């Protein structure tokens, strides 16, 4: 209650989230019968502009089909996907469904202006500006838990030597790659090759310059570590994605040829030439996959999926990273001790536990991984095979984060931030200010 009053101390009215728009987000993390088609796209786009603006007729027909169902937002998983619907998708979504998405991008930017109020202006310290040395979420010593790029790494690699910068990548040092192809992919490589696939267009293909500038990583950090634990109330962890079968699903296509004197099939029920018609529903097709989740998609919109050939990717890699305390706090007493932060690369955060759907086996798509003590599934860590039976007693009480991604005395956010979420009584509009006033450094 002391921290929640601190959240009200910044709740003077800098920005408020609308209360009718909160319930669309809480339902989204509460969703059962939440179709895994959206999860497959969240692995498919990767956050690439080239893939997103190609699949725009699908996603608009995906969201409108979902907003007409649940009165709950879609694509709440990846923050990169959230802002792209706000920016590069216009008003072709309905009038109310956009206003939910307007608030979230505003609310993330609203948290960013807390810092510039509480930092005094002045010169840099070696080797970064001192408006960054108060709020931990602006420092590049952190990483977002799910990073699709190497942008946060390259902002980090410019930092000076006598504060350590070592970032391990699967037991290797990171090596970059511009783009992949169908004949290039080679999923099961173990080396330090990482990927940079999300670009504006294919004409750029850059490696050593980061795409869009350093505030873009800050918006991702503010979303996953402030917004996400406030709405989800624990209950959500991340997952590595088997790219073997995700691409192998989505390229299954059944679209019948159309008589030239006939119009476009629109009605999903009565049209036999419709792709989601029950005559075209064959098992293990994607037409079967949409109908599993009550999604209405037009006929020729289905053929836009061919862009997933070009911009591909590979394995979810675990990334330990090592920094020893940021400048102004480096003293001869404190050099040797380190701060380790876990972060998956190209991973998916599971927004709800799902067990009772035996239409998908546990492990066909997603390999669940608890990055941080914030992100630990109380249910879908315990029921992912193979799990030892003596632990599902103890799995609910404590998180099960492996120290291959950092432990709870070394990680920069310790345990009792997580317990403050579960004991919150002030509502969502006060917690988002309350966490931000916690994340300031001592």
């Amino acid at each position: 209650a002391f921290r929640d009053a601190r959240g009200l101390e910044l709740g003077v009215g800098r920005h408020a989230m609308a209360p009718a728009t909160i319930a669309a987000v809480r339902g989204a993390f509460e969703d059962r019968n939440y179709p895994a088609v959206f999860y497959l796209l969240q692995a498919a786009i990767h956050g690439s502009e080239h893939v997103f603006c190609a699949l725009a007729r699908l996603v608009v027909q995906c969201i409108t089909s979902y907003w007409n169902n649940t009165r709950c937002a879609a694509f709440v998983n990846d923050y990169s996907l959230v802002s792209y619907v706000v920016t590069y998708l216009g008003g072709d979504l309905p009038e109310e469904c956009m206003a939910v998405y307007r608030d979230l991008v505003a609310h993330v930017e609203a948290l960013a202006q807390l810092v510039d109020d509480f930092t005094l202006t002045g010169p840099e310290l070696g080797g970064q500006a001192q408006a960054e040395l108060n709020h931990l979420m602006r420092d590049p010593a952190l990483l977002p838990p799910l990073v699709w790029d190497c942008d946060a790494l390259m902002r980090r690699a410019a930092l000076d030597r006598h504060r350590d910068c070592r970032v391990s990548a699967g037991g290797h040092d990171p090596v970059y790659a511009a783009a992949c192809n169908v004949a290039t992919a080679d999923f099961n490589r173990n080396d330090g090759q990482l990927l940079h696939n999300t670009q504006a267009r294919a004409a750029d293909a850059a490696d050593d310059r980061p795409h869009r500038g350093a505030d873009w990583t800050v918006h991702h950090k503010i979303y996953y570590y402030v917004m996400v634990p406030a709405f989800s109330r624990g209950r959500c962890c991340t997952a590595g994605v088997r790219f073997d079968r995700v691409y192998a699903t989505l390229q299954n296509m059944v679209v019948p040829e159309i008589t030239p004197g006939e119009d476009c099939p629109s009605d999903p029920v009565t049209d036999p030439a419709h792709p989601l018609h029950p005559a075209n529903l064959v098992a293990n097709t994607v037409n079967a996959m949409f109908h599993n989740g009550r999604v209405v998609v037009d006929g020729p919109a289905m053929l836009t999926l061919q862009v997933l050939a070009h911009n591909m990717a590979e394995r979810t890699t675990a990334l330990l990273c090592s920094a020893a305390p940021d400048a102004g706090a480096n003293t001869a007493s404190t050099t040797n001790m380190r701060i380790f932060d876990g972060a998956l690369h190209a991973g998916i955060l599971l927004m709800a536990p799902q067990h009772l759907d035996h239409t998908i086996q546990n492990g066909d798509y997603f390999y669940p991984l608890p990055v941080h003590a914030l992100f630990a599934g109380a249910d879908h860590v315990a029921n992912a095979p193979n799990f030892p039976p003596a632990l599902r007693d103890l799995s609910r009480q404590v998180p099960l984060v492996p120290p291959a991604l950092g432990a709870n005395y070394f990680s920069s956010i310790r345990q009792p931030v997580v317990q403050h979420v579960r004991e919150s009584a002030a509502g969502e509009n006060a917690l988002t200010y309350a966490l931000m006033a916690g994340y300031f450094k001592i």
Binding site: S168, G170, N190, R315
Partner: protein, 49 residues
């Protein structure tokens, strides 16, 4: 620990390594979370030192 091997089978290799060590005693930092702020001041914890 350092990340050994591929991460596609990381956690399943983890729990088999630590299946004994998790349940021998109580984790320290979690049990402090359920302490009343007056109970934490008391010598019931013996972790004040």
């Amino acid at each position: 620990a350092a990340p050994a091997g591929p991460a596609a089978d990381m956690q399943q290799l983890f729990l088999n390594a630590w299946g004994q060590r998790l349940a021998h005693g109580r984790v320290r930092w979690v049990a402090e979370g359920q302490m009343t702020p007056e109970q934490f001041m008391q010598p019931d914890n013996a972790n004040l030192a």
